[PDB]
Structure formats: structure tokens, C-alpha cells
């Protein structure tokens, strides 16, 4: 259901609706961002609510042979999200579908290094029997990061859950990485580490027990 | 796909350029030319006249 | 106008699903109300919607399996999904359904149709599907230099989804930043929420991370000290 | 309304109506009622010089 559409930095993009209305028109237009509320831009072919501001525009219904386009003009990074497009025709009849998702993603945005920060398993999880080492990555772009766990000198392959990317109210992606143990594993080696790779470049940090 | 007209679809078979040879095309046709042909009434119709 | 949603979160599959929404801001035997969805991995998915003579009108992709009610008495607006399976996992949003009349020609010839645009939505609810029941994490205390510290809790082994973590009340703010969770091979979720301290306010303020997992429903206070 | 031309025989060719484009709208006439009941008016005034 997703169309994937790539643009830049507020170039100019036609989203273009994936029905042809075969009548007189009426076309609402959603944007749908991931673990938002949906929000109403277009009703009515081209009329938009208050809040709306200037930069998302419709296409008129004037019988002319025109295909429904939406029309935004200038995309931030907080523009990029899902677009659905609502067809009502008086042809297809009570449209239930609001069709395929255009999601939209916002390119050349300036490269952001990742900010990580490792955390030792807490004391009190020590005395459940348990060991979790978090390692929390965030305020990074593009969302592409690899991350590596290394006991000692020799990188840990098994235990490693690590979240996918996702962009959060920063626009910016953030990541977590849990590598679970148990008490006398923790304490067997001196010391771990968690090690991602942004962009080909190397950053790490370091605990150990005490 | 409306619910609750006046023209109807009606598809049949037509002869073509050669004689052995039948095609099956479409047509729209009005309410006003065409009655059905079994009032039994299933959906099938023949023209007017 | 506000709306806001609430769920059980998690049922068993092949029973009864009810779910409620309570509308803020205007009457609600005045509008029309429906009802939207959106599983993982699928599109917004119409339910249905009824009319101010509640008279109600559902998406027949459902097989007749919602329906939706009004309550003047307590102006909530309640959609029950009625015998569901794992695929019916989604977030619901109750929204305002205003309808438009296209004319394009004579009334009397009914040459217009009427059309229905949402402009007033609500957060939405997480709901889950599993056979399994409800677990509480049991979340630790991350103890905390460019002049700040980091500071988190650890919210460890929960199921289902979501947690949402407060800092202070009102006090902490930012730079709060909670971590999306993490879906375990056992099946389990857990999250982090770390915040930015500065190194003298240590020793001095008290800090506590208020760990809400409302379908579980779990609550564990803990008071973070290096 | 489309023009759907099908060859029914060599060099007949039959013309059928082909899907509508745009919406269905049924034919209708429009009379200014201002103008009619006007004229209705001065054809009774006629009409009463045989009946009365
Ligand atoms: C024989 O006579 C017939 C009867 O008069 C005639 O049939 C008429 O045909 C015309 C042309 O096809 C139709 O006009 C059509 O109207 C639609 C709808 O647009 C209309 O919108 C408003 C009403 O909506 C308002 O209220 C809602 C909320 O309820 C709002 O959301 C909305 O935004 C509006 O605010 C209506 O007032 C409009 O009329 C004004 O505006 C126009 C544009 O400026 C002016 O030109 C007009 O004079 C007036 O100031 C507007 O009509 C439109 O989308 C279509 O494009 C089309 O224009 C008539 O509906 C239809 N019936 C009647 C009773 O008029 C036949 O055409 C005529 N001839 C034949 C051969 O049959
Ligand atoms: C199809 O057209 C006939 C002709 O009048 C009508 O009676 C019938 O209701 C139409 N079908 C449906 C499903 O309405
Ligand atoms: C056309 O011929 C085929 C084969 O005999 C038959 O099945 C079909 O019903 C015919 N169609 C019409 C409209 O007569
Ligand atoms: C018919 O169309 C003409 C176009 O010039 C217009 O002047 C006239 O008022 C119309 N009359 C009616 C009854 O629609
Ligand atoms: C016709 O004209 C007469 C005289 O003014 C008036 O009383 C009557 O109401 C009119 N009727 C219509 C249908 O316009």
C-alpha cells in the first residue's frame, strides 16, 4: 500500500492520485504521520481547513480532463509522512477505501552524528539474576547505523536486540541496542563495549564492572 | 453502481466480416428500446421492434 | 473539538472487543461519528460511521462485525469489533464526519452525491491480539563532564505496548527523550527514557521517571541516585 | 456520449453507444415560467371568446 516518492529539500512535488475520477469530483487529501492522528488538507478538490497552512493545495474540478493532485510546494522535514487521497465520484459510488499511502521522504538534510550513551546493568537487576547493557543512539541522519557489541577483544554475536531507526521529534533518528547477559557472564570479562558505525565513521563507549 | 436508470448494457453475440467467425462485443442501449425476453424474468432482453 | 480513546489493550482472540471514545468540545447527538483503524503493515481502514438519527452505516469489508452506538448520557462514543483474530491488531481513532454535497447538475434529478471529509481526529488507542496475558516490567533505576549527566530508567520486560514515561509531573520536560520499545524473541517490550541533568543539580534535586503501562496496567516508582 | 463503430459484415458497419464520459445526466428542457404562464394567459383570453 506504500508508493514510495523521492525528493529533496523542498523541491517541488506532484502527488498524484493513483484513481482517475471518472466523473465530477470531490477529493479530500490526509496527511498520516507514524503514531499520529491523521490530519485533514484538502477537502472538497482544493478548500482546506484553518491551520492548514499555505503550502498544501488541491486540484479544482472544472471538467476539465485533470487528473486529482496534491500539491505541496516546498516540503520541511516535518512534511514527510503518508499522503492518502479520498475519491468521491459520482461514478464509483460510497468510496470506503481511502487508497494507497504516498509516503514521502525528505532528502539532502544535513548529516547529524549520533549522540550514544552506554548504561551497565543496574544493581538491582543484578540480584534478580539478571544483566542488561543499553546502549541508546539518537540525533543521527540518515537512519542507516550498525551496531556492534565486543566482549573484551572479540565481538559478541549472540543476545544483541537492537531496535530499527526511526526519526523522532527532532527529526532526527534514535536507536537502542540491548545486549541481555547473566550475572556471572557480566562479571566474568573486564569490560564491554558498544560500537556502531554512522556513515563509515566509528564511535564506541565503554563499561565495566565495579 | 448506484442503488435504488434509464439505459441498460445489454453484451451479445454479433456476426463479424466473415460468416464463420462471431464476436461477443458491448453496447449501451436505453430503457425505452429494449424489453425482456422472458418476463420470467431472469436478465436477458431483445430489441423493441 | 478534543477526543480521546480508551482501550483494554489486549483480549484473547475469537471473543468480544469494545472500545470507547469520549468527545470533548461539542455535542454529540450533533454530529456524525466514525470510526478509523490502521493495522501494521496496512492503510487506513474505514469502519463505519452513524448519523445524528442514529442510524449507523459500516464498511461491508468487515463482514458486519462492528457497531457503533451513541451515549448522550455520558457523551462517549463506543465501537465494538465483536469476534476478531490476529489480523484486526490495529489503532483505532474515533473522528468528526462532516457531510459535503457535490451538486453537479439538476437536484430533482439526483445529479449530486454526498461525501464524507474527517477534520477532528483523535490520538487513536493501541490494541493487541494475543493469546497471551498482560506483564508488568519491572523497570531499574540507570544511575548518572560537558556539564550534564545522563539519568534514565530502565523499563524492562513489559507486554504489550505502549509505556508512556513522565519525568516530575510537569517539572521535568526537557531534555526528556523516551526510546522507542523493543520487541524481544520472547515476546516481550521494553524501553528506555533517559534525561539530560546538569552535574551540580546532583545531590540536590530529586528525580523520579512516573512508568505508565496502561494495558498491562503497571505502575513502578523509582528514585534515581548515582 | 462515444461513438463504438463494430463491423457487423464486409462494409457494414453497425454504430453503438459507447461507455458515457463524464457523469450520467438524463435529457431535460428548461421554459421561463414567466414567459408561459404569460402567453398561457393571453391564449384563454381566446379560448373564453368561444366558451363563454
Ligand atoms: C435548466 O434549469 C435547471 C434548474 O435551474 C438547471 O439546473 C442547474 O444547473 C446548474 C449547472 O449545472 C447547477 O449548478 C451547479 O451547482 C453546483 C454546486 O455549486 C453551487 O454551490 C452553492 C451551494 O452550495 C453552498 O452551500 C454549501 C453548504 O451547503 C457550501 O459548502 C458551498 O461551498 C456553497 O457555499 C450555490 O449557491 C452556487 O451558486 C452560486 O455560485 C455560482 C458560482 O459563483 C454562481 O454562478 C451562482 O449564480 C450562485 O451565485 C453553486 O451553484 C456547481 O458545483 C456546478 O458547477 C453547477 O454550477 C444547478 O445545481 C442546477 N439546479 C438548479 C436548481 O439550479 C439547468 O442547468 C438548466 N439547463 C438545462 C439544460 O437543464
Ligand atoms: C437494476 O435495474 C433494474 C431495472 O429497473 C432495477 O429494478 C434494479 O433495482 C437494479 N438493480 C439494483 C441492484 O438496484
Ligand atoms: C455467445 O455464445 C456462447 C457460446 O455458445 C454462449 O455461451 C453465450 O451465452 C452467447 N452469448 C450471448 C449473449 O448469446
Ligand atoms: C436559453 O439559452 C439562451 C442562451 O443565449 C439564454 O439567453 C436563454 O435565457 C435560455 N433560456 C432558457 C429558458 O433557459
Ligand atoms: C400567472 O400569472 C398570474 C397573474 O399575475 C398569477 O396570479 C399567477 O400566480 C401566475 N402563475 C404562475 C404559475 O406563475
Known amino acids: 500500500y506504500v508508493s514510495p516518492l523521492s525528493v529533496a529539500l523542498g523541491e517541488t512535488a506532484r502527488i498524484s492520485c493513483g484513481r482517475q475520477a471518472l466523473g465530477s469530483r470531490a477529493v479530500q487529501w490526509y496527511q498520516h504521520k507514524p503514531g499520529q492522528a491523521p490530519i485533514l488538507l484538502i477537502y472538497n478538490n482544493q478548500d482546506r481547513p484553518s491551520g492548514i497552512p499555505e503550502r498544501f493545495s488541491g486540484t479544482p474540478d472544472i471538467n476539465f480532463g485533470t487528473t486529482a493532485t496534491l500539491t505541496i510546494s516546498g516540503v520541511e522535514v516535518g512534511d514527510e509522512a503518508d499522503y492518502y487521497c479520498h475519491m468521491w465520484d459520482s461514478r464509483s459510488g460510497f468510496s470506503w477505501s481511502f487508497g494507497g499511502a504516498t509516503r514521502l521522504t525528505v532528502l539532502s538534510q544535513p548529516k547529524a552524528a549520533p549522540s550514544v550513551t552506554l548504561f551497565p546493568p543496574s544493581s538491582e537487576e543484578l540480584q534478580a539474576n539478571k544483566a542488561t547493557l543499553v546502549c541508546l543512539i539518537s540525533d543521527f541522519y540518515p537512519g542507516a547505523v550498525t551496531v556492534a557489541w565486543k566482549a573484551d577483544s572479540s565481538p559478541v554475536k549472540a543476545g544483541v536486540e537492537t531496535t530499527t531507526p526511526s526519526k523522532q521529534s527532532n527529526n532526527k533518528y534514535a536507536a537502542s541496542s540491548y545486549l541481555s547477559l547473566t550475572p556471572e557472564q557480566w562479571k566474568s570479562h573486564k569490560s564491554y563495549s558498544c560500537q556502531v558505525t554512522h556513515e563509515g565513521s566509528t564511535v564506541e563507549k565503554t563499561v565495566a564492572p565495579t | 453502481n448506484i442503488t435504488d436508470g434509464e439505459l441498460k448494457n445489454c453484451s451479445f453475440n454479433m456476426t463479424t466480416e466473415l460468416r464463420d467467425k462471431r464476436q461477443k462485443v458491448h453496447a449501451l442501449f436505453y430503457k425505452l428500446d429494449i424489453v425482456p425476453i422472458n418476463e420470467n424474468q431472469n436478465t436477458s432482453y431483445r430489441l423493441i421492434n | 473539538v478534543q477526543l480521546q480513546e480508551s482501550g483494554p489493550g489486549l483480549v484473547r482472540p475469537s471473543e468480544t472487543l469494545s472500545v470507547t471514545c469520549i468527545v470533548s468540545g461539542g455535542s454529540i447527538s450533533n454530529y456524525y461519528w466514525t470510526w478509523i483503524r490502521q493495522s501494521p503493515g496496512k492503510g487506513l481502514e474505514w469502519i463505519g460511521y452513524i448519523s445524528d438519527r442514529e442510524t449507523t452505516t459500516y464498511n461491508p469489508s468487515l463482514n458486519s462485525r462492528a457497531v457503533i452506538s451513541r451515549d448522550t448520557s455520558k457523551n462517549q462514543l463506543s465501537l465494538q469489533l465483536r469476534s476478531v483474530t490476529t489480523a484486526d491488531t490495529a489503532i483505532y481513532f474515533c473522528?468528526?464526519?462532516?457531510?459535503?454535497?457535490?451538486?453537479?447538475?439538476?437536484?430533482?434529478?439526483?445529479?449530486?452525491?454526498?461525501?464524507?471529509?474527517?477534520?477532528?481526529w483523535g490520538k487513536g488507542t493501541a490494541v493487541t491480539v494475543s493469546s497471551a496475558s498482560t506483564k508488568g516490567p519491572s523497570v531499574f533505576p540507570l544511575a548518572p563532564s560537558g556539564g550534564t549527566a545522563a539519568l534514565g530508567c530502565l523499563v524492562k520486560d513489559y507486554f504489550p505496548e505502549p509505556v508512556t514515561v513522565s519525568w516530575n509531573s510537569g517539572a521535568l520536560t526537557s531534555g526528556v527523550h523516551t526510546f522507542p520499545a523493543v520487541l524481544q524473541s520472547s515476546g516481550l517490550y521494553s524501553l528506555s527514557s533517559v534525561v539530560t541533568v546538569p552535574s551540580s543539580s546532583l545531590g540536590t534535586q530529586t528525580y523520579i521517571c512516573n512508568v505508565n503501562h496502561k494495558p498491562s496496567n503497571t505502575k513502578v516508582d523509582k528514585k534515581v541516585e548515582p | 456520449n462515444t461513438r463504438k463503430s463494430i463491423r457487423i459484415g464486409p462494409g457494414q458497419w453497425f454504430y453503438a453507444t459507447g461507455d458515457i464520459i463524464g457523469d450520467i445526466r438524463q435529457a431535460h428542457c428548461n421554459v421561463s415560467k414567466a414567459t408561459w404562464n404569460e402567453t398561457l394567459g393571453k391564449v384563454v383570453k381566446q379560448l373564453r371568446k368561444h366558451f363563454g
Open positions: 473522528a468528526t464526519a462532516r457531510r459535503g454535497q457535490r451538486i453537479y447538475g439538476v437536484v430533482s434529478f439526483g445529479e449530486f452525491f454526498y461525501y464524507y471529509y474527517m477534520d477532528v
